[PDB]
């Protein structure tokens, strides 16, 4: 059987998988139980940072990731790490 | 993500970091009409850039922005970069750090000027200059070996042992596919076909890429070319002219193997790889021979791996097996290495910051990286 | 249980007391990156310890922690000890007393510092420093005799009679297998082969261990060396290079017998054994000659016992028979002595306590042990 | 009279014994026309020998008969010898004994074969092979000292005290001016200038011989290289190309001092001289430091004596003054030593006779001379 309860985690809300069309904008919302900690985002094999093409919005305990250039390239998996907590989610793109 | 641009000879490869294949592949050429045009209603398009030039190649006088890994004219390069950023990529330079891949033992001026243009002409928070031999190795997925990297411009060999490098052991060779193209055009004239213009110069190169192949034994094919049947093929030009080649196609790739036809003292590609091995430490030599990796545009022709294997095995000791790995699409391996290289967490810390440039100066590139 | 560590030149032997064979045998070497590495995805690993270094020997520059029975750098020794306690032994220093063995007439600083590091760096209730000549004798199982102890460090002779030792009768000789290796590398260069690197330095030593042998008479084989039929063999290096040697192989072992080639006044091993005997009392001399025991790394080559027997018999009186006991695995005899020595109950009381060190001071080592 | 010929790396020096300067100095090179010749007035001279080759260096392919004191091709050497005895000396080999000079710890085959050809190919009643360190000392005129002999082949150190020499104190170093030339050519490529041909290989060496000098401090000059004024000079090639060099020329001689640039573990010339001194006995060491003599091809650059003097004085005790003697034209000192060495009456008895060679064999060379 499964353990039952996971080790203490830093995410209040886990980002959930969604589906996006090619050229269609994509927005992900994630939340953390504790504030004051930077949240790092990872794309299938490449890290995501607060720079253009990608958008990071950090308000209080809420972190938002926005991708407007998402296409066939982005098909894969995304990982997000807040402090010591490891979590990942899948993005689906249809041609 | 991140942006990766390969500014090699004749072709500009552009794409996004983390992607297995680049978004934009097109020749780095600018074509202008040498001769006055005759027609009514033509837009008279003075400048042609990219693959458009390839279609209208006969009328246009093609010019290469990059010669021997050196860029002759900076504005043409900007048009190329502009074309890659806003055409096929459809992204802004501001958005991500930009990774450029450079061949081993390249001049100091090229790295300093290249970074200066990227910091000034295209504003980006950071950039990094990579080395082709190490990036090719990553595509291979092997920690230890010797990498022979032959681009469209200059062939280079860079051995590597478990991540440690030997700068003395690295050897630069002046033999390349572009050189073969010049030899090739020179060889065609004796037969009775002459090409003296850059625009038709590409036509012989095109012939070389698919029609040309490497003979198991040079002397035997020449001997059997007297009664050629399957040795001759007909190539159709966009112009409409018909070209028939025979023993001529296989003796061209041969020159890399046999520089004597060229008239130069320097040894061929198999001897040079051997020389690089000799430079390297004796202990690490034994797995160097079995870990040989082929890369670049001039390694595409079939039979190269088989000819190299027999030649390396005979020259080298017989106490160990000789293995050569030559995967397909090795031409694009250098660009691929750039996309994978920018995909490592450790690597992002390593990028050359704008602040560091402003304080320390342009000369810090050699200090910071190989 | 108990922990026994033999810190001899070239190799570190570690194991558990009461065991007939040590758990961890590896060379005592520390490797650092001579050249900067250019790849991303490595932990860099600036320091390498043990057999790992042997695999990555070419890039790394090997450094020996112990020279002539003296340790040049203490931290490197810790890394070796750390490696032996956790990597192969898989035990904690706290758990048992630790026995170390040291060669005769060794400098004061090495015993005091060695105990200081063992008491401070690795916490243990007690430790003991022993002498190699006496431990070898116990392995032999003989109460009376003369012990010739030669390692890869410094050759030492320590005669013993019915449990009592003579300090004035102990002679230290500066000849050793490592010294032979330096002579050997020097001798190879005249022939036409040159080794100037520490990594390949080991390779000549490897050759010496199995290819080299002791000639019954140096002059006669050299005389017949002009026409070599069976005196030449082919040795294969990891490099792939092929080496053939003739009279060169037997002349190296000869140097211990005939130091004149080295360029030093001091007499060879047979003369030195004789000199040690002369120092000792005349009454106990008679069973010293028949009780000769050979030990250490440089006594490995076959025929040494046979050459020594005839030479000692010739120089020594004929009134008594000469017997030399030189059993195989004498190289590991010193370590073996350490494991057996720790085994005795009486011995455990004799170990230098942590409490004694703190109160009396470091100078008590000489005061307690010999 | 008598004939003295120096068959060293890169050139052949010939002259008459008893003369302060040789009659014939030219490079030891053979050149052939690699390129087909299309001219209206040539005899198509296929082979060129000597200084004639130097003028026509670009068209010709130059091959060195001697590599590391080893002759690759015997006929070319014969042509050189024929040229030296007849063209400038205008004398017959039969007429006088001939003296040749050889570096320490050179292979057995070189002395035996060299004597064999001198006795057979050129008929002479007797010949002798000398050691460079002892002859250089005679030019100096000092009975005691340490001789650092660095030719165009291999750097050697041979200390001597009041007529007696220590074979174990003689150390061979693998650094040489020719090696520097290879390093230099490798260095030029990073600046954007590339030389991959033997004919132009000489041109960088020519630059090095007069343009290059030894910096008081390597790091300080590199720092001031940014605002170079007097640092950069221009060199004119026979081809017509113009070469400009700055901090690049003085950083080459530095490598002998600092091998780390080369990538080799072995220490520089000042450390090696020190090591040789350590090998030597303690009593004779004190006048060894004050009697240091510099000789050979790579010791030519100004400031070497001053940099070594400060470095030797710093490392060595200050209780004794350190004096280094570096007279001009020390490159030709070895040849000069050969002419003076043959001059002495005692020396004539010492020459290896033809009769002795036939009666015993080539192997007697080691038996007779050092």
Are A51 and B17 a contacting pair at CB < 8 A?
no
> What is the count of residue pairs from C and D with beta carbons less than 8 Å apart?
29
Least CB-CB distance to A51: which of B95, B340, B343? B95
Closest CA relative to residue A83, chosen from A6, A29, A5, A9: A9
Taking only residues 256 to 275 of chain C, the set having a beta carbon closer than 8 angstroms to any beta carbon of chain D reads 262-263
- Among A23, A46, A80, which would you mutate to test the B interface (most chain B Cβ atoms within 10 Å of its Cβ)? A46
Q: Alpha-carbon distance B14 to B285, whole Å? A: 36
Q: Are strands C233-236 and D24-27 parallel, antiparallel or unpaired?
A: unpaired
Q: Alpha-carbon distance B357 to B226, whole Å? A: 63
Which residue in this structure is represented by tokens 């689906």? A92
Which residue in this structure is represented by tokens 């060879």? C268
Q: Alpha-carbon distance B148 to B155, whole Å? A: 7
Closest CA relative to residue B79, chosen from B116, B36, B26: B26
Which residue in this structure is represented by tokens 């640039």? D261
Neighbour-count burial of A95, counting CB atoms closer than 10 A to its CB (0-12 exposed, 13-18 middle, 19+ buried): exposed
- Contact present, D246 and D225 (Cβ < 8 Å): yes
Q: Alpha-carbon distance A81 to B183, whole Å? A: 56
Residues of B in contact with D261 (CB under 8 A): none
Q: Alpha-carbon distance D312 to D322, whole Å? A: 7
For residue C143, the tally of other CB atoms under 10 A from its CB is 12
Are D190 and B108 a contacting pair at CB < 8 A?
yes
Query: Could you give the dihedral angle defined by the CA atoms of residues C310, C316, C321 and C327, in that order, rounded to the nearest 10 degrees?
Result: -50
Query: Could you give the dihedral angle defined by the CA atoms of residues C8, C14, C16 and C21, in that order, rounded to the nearest 10 degrees?
Result: -80
Residue B299, SS3 per DSSP: helix
Taking only residues 123 to 182 of chain D, the set having a beta carbon closer than 8 angstroms to any beta carbon of chain C reads 166-169, 172, 174
- Contact present, B162 and C59 (Cβ < 8 Å): yes
Q: Alpha-carbon distance C259 to B277, whole Å? A: 40
Residues of D in contact with C263 (CB under 8 A): 166-169
**Chains B/A: 3 or more C-beta pairs closer than 8 A?**
yes
Q: Are strands A62-67 and A76-82 parallel, antiparallel or unpaired?
A: unpaired
Q: Alpha-carbon distance C188 to C249, whole Å? A: 10
- Contact present, B358 and A61 (Cβ < 8 Å): no
Q: CA-nearest residue of chain D to C196?
A: D266
| C206 touches B at CB < 8 Å | no
Q: What are the tokens at B283?
A: 């202990």
Angle between helices C269-279 and C248-257 (to 10 degrees): 10
Contacts of C227 (CB under 8 A, 6+ apart): none
Residue B56 Cα, gap to closest chain C Cα (Å): 43
Three-point CA angle C343, C349, C352, nearest 5°: 105
Angle between helices C198-210 and C177-191 (to 10 degrees): 100
For residue C279, the tally of other CB atoms under 10 A from its CB is 13
Residues of C in contact with D263 (CB under 8 A): 34-35
Taking only residues 91 to 130 of chain D, the set having a beta carbon closer than 8 angstroms to any beta carbon of chain C reads 105-109
Q: Are strands D171-173 and C126-131 parallel, antiparallel or unpaired?
A: unpaired
Q: What are the tokens at A69?
A: 């250039």
Q: Alpha-carbon distance C21 to C18, whole Å? A: 9
Q: Alpha-carbon distance D234 to D241, whole Å? A: 10
DSSP lists the bridge partners of residue D56 as none
DSSP lists the bridge partners of residue B160 as B145, B165
Query: Could you give the dihedral angle defined by the CA atoms of residues B133, B139, B142 and B146, in that order, rounded to the nearest 10 degrees?
Result: -30
Q: What are the tokens at D333?
A: 């000192």
Are D35 and B168 a contacting pair at CB < 8 A?
no
Contacts of C271 (CB under 8 A, 6+ apart): none
Q: What are the tokens at C247?
A: 């009279």
Which residue in this structure is represented by tokens 């002498």? C131
Which residue in this structure is represented by tokens 């290989």? D201
Q: Alpha-carbon distance C200 to C210, whole Å? A: 16
Closest CA relative to residue B260, chosen from B200, B361, B183: B183
Which residue in this structure is represented by tokens 């036509």? B203
Residues of D in contact with C35 (CB under 8 A): 263
Backbone angles phi, psi at D244, to 5 degrees: -120, 130
DSSP lists the bridge partners of residue A41 as A48, A80
Residues of B in contact with C37 (CB under 8 A): 163-165
Q: Alpha-carbon distance D324 to B234, whole Å? A: 77
Are C263 and D107 a contacting pair at CB < 8 A?
no
Q: What are the tokens at B295?
A: 């890369």
Q: Alpha-carbon distance D156 to D246, whole Å? A: 31
Residues of D in contact with B174 (CB under 8 A): 194, 196
Q: Alpha-carbon distance B2 to B19, whole Å? A: 10
Three-point CA angle C304, C307, C312, nearest 5°: 115
Contacts of B257 (CB under 8 A, 6+ apart): B214, B218, B268, B269, B270, B307
Q: Alpha-carbon distance B112 to B102, whole Å? A: 12
DSSP lists the bridge partners of residue B352 as B127
- Contact present, D300 and D330 (Cβ < 8 Å): yes
Q: Alpha-carbon distance D76 to D84, whole Å? A: 12
Q: Are strands B324-325 and B292-295 parallel, antiparallel or unpaired?
A: parallel
Q: What are the tokens at B316?
A: 């080298």
**Chains A/C: 3 or more C-beta pairs closer than 8 A?**
no
Contacts of D251 (CB under 8 A, 6+ apart): D187, D215, D218, D222, D261
> In the Cβ-directed half-sphere of B162, how many Cα atoms lie within 13 Å?
19
Least CB-CB distance to B19: which of A52, A69, A73? A73
Q: What are the tokens at C1?
A: 């249980």
Q: Are strands D145-150 and D292-295 parallel, antiparallel or unpaired?
A: parallel
Q: Alpha-carbon distance A29 to A56, whole Å? A: 10
What DSSP letter does each residue of B202-221 carry, written as one string? Answer: HHHHHHHHHT----SSHHHH
Residue C271, SS3 per DSSP: helix
Q: Alpha-carbon distance B172 to B170, whole Å? A: 7
Residues of A in contact with B343 (CB under 8 A): 45-46
- Contact present, C60 and C45 (Cβ < 8 Å): no
Angle between helices D198-210 and D177-190 (to 10 degrees): 100
Residue D363 Cα, gap to closest chain B Cα (Å): 32
Q: Alpha-carbon distance B126 to D47, whole Å? A: 59
Q: Alpha-carbon distance D180 to D201, whole Å? A: 11
Are A45 and B90 a contacting pair at CB < 8 A?
no
Residue A26 Cα, gap to closest chain B Cα (Å): 15
Q: Are strands D292-295 and D324-325 parallel, antiparallel or unpaired?
A: parallel
Least CB-CB distance to D191: which of B108, B263, B266? B108
Residue B326 Cα, gap to closest chain D Cα (Å): 28
First to last CA, chain C: 25
Q: Alpha-carbon distance B61 to B68, whole Å? A: 19
Three-point CA angle B73, B74, B75, nearest 5°: 100
* Resolution value in angstroms: 11.0
For residue C232, the tally of other CB atoms under 10 A from its CB is 13
> In the Cβ-directed half-sphere of B80, how many Cα atoms lie within 13 Å?
28
Residue B129 Cα, gap to closest chain C Cα (Å): 12
Residue C155, SS3 per DSSP: strand
Q: What are the tokens at B323?
A: 């293995």
Neighbour-count burial of C28, counting CB atoms closer than 10 A to its CB (0-12 exposed, 13-18 middle, 19+ buried): buried
For residue D113, the tally of other CB atoms under 10 A from its CB is 15
Contacts of D147 (CB under 8 A, 6+ apart): D133, D134, D136, D137, D157, D158, D159, D160, D293, D295
Backbone angles phi, psi at D229, to 5 degrees: -120, -70
Backbone angles phi, psi at B47, to 5 degrees: -120, 130
């Amino acid at each position: 059987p499964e353990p039952g309860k996971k080790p203490v985690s830093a995410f209040s809300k886990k980002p959930r998988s969604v589906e996006v069309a090619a050229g269609s904008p994509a927005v992900f919302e994630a939340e953390t139980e504790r504030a004051g900690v930077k949240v790092r985002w990872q794309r299938g094999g490449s890290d995501i940072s607060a720079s253009n093409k990608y958008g990071l919005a950090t308000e209080g305990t809420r972190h938002t990731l926005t991708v407007r250039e998402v296409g066939p390239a982005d098909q894969g998996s995304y990982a997000v790490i807040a402090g010591s907590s490891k979590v990942k989610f899948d993005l689906k793109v249809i041609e | 993500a991140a942006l990766v641009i390969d500014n090699g000879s004749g072709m500009c490869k552009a794409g996004f970091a983390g992607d297995d294949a680049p978004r934009a592949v097109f020749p780095s050429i600018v074509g202008r009409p040498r001769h006055q045009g005759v027609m009514v209603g033509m837009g008279q398009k003075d400048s042609y850039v990219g693959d458009e030039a390839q279609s209208k190649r006969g009328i246009l006088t093609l010019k290469y922005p990059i010669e021997h890994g050196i860029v002759t004219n900076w504005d043409d390069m900007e048009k190329i970069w502009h074309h890659t950023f806003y055409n096929e990529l459809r992204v802004a330079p501001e958005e991500h750090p930009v990774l450029l891949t450079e061949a081993p033992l390249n001049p100091k001026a090229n790295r300093e000027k290249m970074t200066q243009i990227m910091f000034e002409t295209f504003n980006t928070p950071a950039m990094y200059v990579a080395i082709q031999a190490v990036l090719s190795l990553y595509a291979s997925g092997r920690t230890t070996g010797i990498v022979m990297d032959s681009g469209d411009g200059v062939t280079h060999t860079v051995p590597i042992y478990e991540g440690y490098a030997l700068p003395h052991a690295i050897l630069r060779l002046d033999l390349a596919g572009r050189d073969l193209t010049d030899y090739l055009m020179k060889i065609l004239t004796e037969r009775g076909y002459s090409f003296t213009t850059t625009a038709e110069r590409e036509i012989v190169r095109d012939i070389k890429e698919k029609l040309c192949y490497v003979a198991l034994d040079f002397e035997q094919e020449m001997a059997t070319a007297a009664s050629s049947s399957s040795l001759e093929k007909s190539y159709e030009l966009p112009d409409g002219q018909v070209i028939t080649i025979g023993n001529e196609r296989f003796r061209c790739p041969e020159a890399l193997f046999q520089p004597s036809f060229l008239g130069m003292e320097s040894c061929g590609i198999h001897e040079t790889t051997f020389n690089s091995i000799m430079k390297c430490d004796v202990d690490i030599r034994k797995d160097l021979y079995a870990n040989t990796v082929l890369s670049g545009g001039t390694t595409m022709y079939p039979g190269i791996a088989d000819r190299m294997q027999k030649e390396i095995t005979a020259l080298a000791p017989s106490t160990m097996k000789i293995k050569i790995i030559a995967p397909p699409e090795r031409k694009y391996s250098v660009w691929i290495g750039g996309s994978i290289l920018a995909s490592l967490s450790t690597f992002q810390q390593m990028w050359i910051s704008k602040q560091e440039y402003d304080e320390s100066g342009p000369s810090i590139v050699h200090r910071k990286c190989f």
